[PDB]
Amino acid sequence: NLEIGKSILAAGVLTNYHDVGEGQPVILIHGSGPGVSAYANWRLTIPALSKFYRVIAPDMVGFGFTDRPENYNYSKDSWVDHIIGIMDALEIEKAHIVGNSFGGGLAIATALRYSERVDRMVLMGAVGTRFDVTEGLNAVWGYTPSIENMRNLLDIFAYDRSLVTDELARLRYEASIQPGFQESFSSMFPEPRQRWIDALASSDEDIKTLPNETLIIHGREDQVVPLSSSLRLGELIDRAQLHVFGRCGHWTQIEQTDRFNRLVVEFFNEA
Amino acid sequence: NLEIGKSILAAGVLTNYHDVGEGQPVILIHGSGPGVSAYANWRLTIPALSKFYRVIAPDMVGFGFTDRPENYNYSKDSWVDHIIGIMDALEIEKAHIVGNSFGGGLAIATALRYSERVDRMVLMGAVGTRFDVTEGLNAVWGYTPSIENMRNLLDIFAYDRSLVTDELARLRYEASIQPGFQESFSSMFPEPRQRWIDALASSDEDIKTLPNETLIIHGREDQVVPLSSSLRLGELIDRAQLHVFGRCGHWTQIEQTDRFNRLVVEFFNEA
Numbered sequence: 311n312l313e314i315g316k317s318i319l320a321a322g323v324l325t326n327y328h329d330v331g332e333g334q335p336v337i338l339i340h341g342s343g344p345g346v347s348a349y350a351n352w353r354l355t356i357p358a359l360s361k362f363y364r365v366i367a368p369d370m371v372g373f374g375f376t377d378r379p380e381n382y383n384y385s386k387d388s389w390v391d392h393i394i395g396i397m398d399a400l401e402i403e404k405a406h407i408v409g410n411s412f413g414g415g416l417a418i419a420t421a422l423r424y425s426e427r428v429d430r431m432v433l434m435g436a437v438g439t440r441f442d443v444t445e446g447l448n449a450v451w452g453y454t455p456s457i458e459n460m461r462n463l464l465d466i467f468a469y470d471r472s473l474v475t476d477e478l479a480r481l482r483y484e485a486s487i488q489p490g491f492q493e494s495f496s497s498m499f500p501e502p503r504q505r506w507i508d509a510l511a512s513s514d515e516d517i518k519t520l521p522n523e524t525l526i527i528h529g530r531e532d533q534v535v536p537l538s539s540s541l542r543l544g545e546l547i548d549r550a551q552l553h554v555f556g557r558c559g560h561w562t563q564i565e566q567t568d569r570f571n572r573l574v575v576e577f578f579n580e581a
Numbered sequence: 582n583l584e585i586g587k588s589i590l591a592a593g594v595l596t597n598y599h600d601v602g603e604g605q606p607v608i609l610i611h612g613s614g615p616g617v618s619a620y621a622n623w624r625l626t627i628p629a630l631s632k633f634y635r636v637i638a639p640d641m642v643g644f645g646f647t648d649r650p651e652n653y654n655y656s657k658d659s660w661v662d663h664i665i666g667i668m669d670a671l672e673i674e675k676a677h678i679v680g681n682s683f684g685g686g687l688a689i690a691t692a693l694r695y696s697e698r699v700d701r702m703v704l705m706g707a708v709g710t711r712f713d714v715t716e717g718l719n720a721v722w723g724y725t726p727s728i729e730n731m732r733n734l735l736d737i738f739a740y741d742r743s744l745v746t747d748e749l750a751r752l753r754y755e756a757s758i759q760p761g762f763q764e765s766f767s768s769m770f771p772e773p774r775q776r777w778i779d780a781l782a783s784s785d786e787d788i789k790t791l792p793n794e795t796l797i798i799h800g801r802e803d804q805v806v807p808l809s810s811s812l813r814l815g816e817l818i819d820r821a822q823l824h825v826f827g828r829c830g831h832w833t834q835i836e837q838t839d840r841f842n843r844l845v846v847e848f849f850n851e852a
């Protein structure tokens with residue numbers, strides 16, 4: 311299973327992660343869909359970025375192949391502490407961070423709580439500001455295993471449904487039923503789910519204080535996180551650039567891979 | 582005067598233009614401020630693009646050093662015909678077009694009337710959709726010569742006013758009073774000026790029919806053309822990407838030069 315990489319103790323949790331490349335460190339933080347993992351989310355991104363940066367892609371506690379501690383208390387603060395724990399474990403004193411959706415909310419929170427540890431930020435379809443729960447997100451977080459339920463989620467993430475094949479739906483369905491996955495996932499974002507969008511999001515007041523060079527990316531047709539969210543982040547963050555991809559869903563790193571990789575690498579190259 | 586380049590008869594008008602580079606043709610269309618010229622608008626863009634493309638930057642009829650025909654009837658259609666006339670004169674059968682503000686409105690109109698002559702489009706703070714006249718645009722089009730009036734316009738175009746020096750204000754003021762310049766300029770967009778925004782703009786219906794790969798660029802703090810205009814173009818044009826630069830005014834090619842040039846060159850490189 312290529313989704314399994316290296317193991318390291320971070321913030322007291324045995325963590326699965328990928329470490330590719332040399333130089334300036336970049337931490338990639340995945341989204342929160344069923345069966346998600348750092349590799350699944352970033353497999354098309356790591357190759358490009360690792361040619362110029364040291365890329366760290368960990369499975370956040372409660373997701374992927376990282377340990378799922380018994381009675382573990384999941385929260386934005388706990389996840390941020392995990393990110394910092396991973397950085398501490400790898401002696402990464404300061405790094406750029408790329409956060410996808412759920413991971414984007416975590417990126418912002420990390421930049422707010424540990425400003426000295428974060429350099430540049432890329433927020434991709436980030437859950438960083440409050441928005442009324444979408445059916446797309448309600449479906450993602452309310453997922454129960456089945457090939458058709460997964461096919462529907464893949465459709466929700468994509469603009470071009472031709473990318474959603476029986477094979478992909480089957481493979482991700484299998485990923486979602488691995489030992490303990492659905493168990494921790496189903497209890498992660500229970501109804502009412504608006505609570506979790508509100509929890510992950512940061513206040514306008516706090517976001518306005520961010521000094522970081524930021525690149526905000528969003529797919530125009532994103533069905534999970536509304537474009538309006540990134541437009542808002544674009545007005546709140548001072549040193550921010552906003553890039554919207556037309557004919558692209560939530561999956562910007564997947565549906566606009568080359569454009570995405572170019573934008574991100576060049577953004578970091580400026581530093 | 583470096584603003585003066587080569588001369589060619591286009592659409593029956595003796596036209597001043599710059600032609601730098603080799604390969605795929607790219608036409609740069611300047612804005613409509615007092616004293617404007619292709620060189621003044623694009624001097625920091627041409628060097629970068631010409632390394633990979635043949636760049637044509639003409640002074641639109643009624644502006645710069647191109648002839649100002651007696652009793653000439655200025656209109657969106659006449660300007661579009663001038664662009665096509667320039668392309669015809671240079672045997673440019675199909676080209677990419679970069680349009681700034683007024684020039685962006687012309688780019689859209691050219692793509693609509695002569696679709697077979699246009700490949701990719703870059704719309705920079707384009708006047709392509711209707712918006713209520715801004716004080717910034719009212720001041721630009723209502724300009725009468727003076728160092729202070731020009732300093733104010735430069736302030737209107739910039740986010741970082743440190744870029745607006747006494748020297749720059751003086752030089753552009755001098756450009757604005759050249760023989761016949763203020764005369765043709767003052768009669769170009771007379772009050773009420775809302776009429777000209779409405780005239781330059783294209784309908785939602787027409788814009789939605791554009792098949793061109795498009796890159797929409799806007800400075801978040803643009804005081805001349807509101808960001809909302811480009812956000813609208815981003816929802817109307819099918820194959821469009823939207824890029825908004827924070828801490829940047831109307832002058833995206835001037836205030837975010839390297840980022841702008843990189844985005845544009847790479848966008849064209851895809852073709």
Ligand SMILES: [Cl-]
Pocket residue numbers: 341342343410411412413437
């Ligand atoms: Cl998510």
Ligand SMILES: [Cl-]
Pocket residue numbers: 612613614681682683684708
């Ligand atoms: Cl203009």
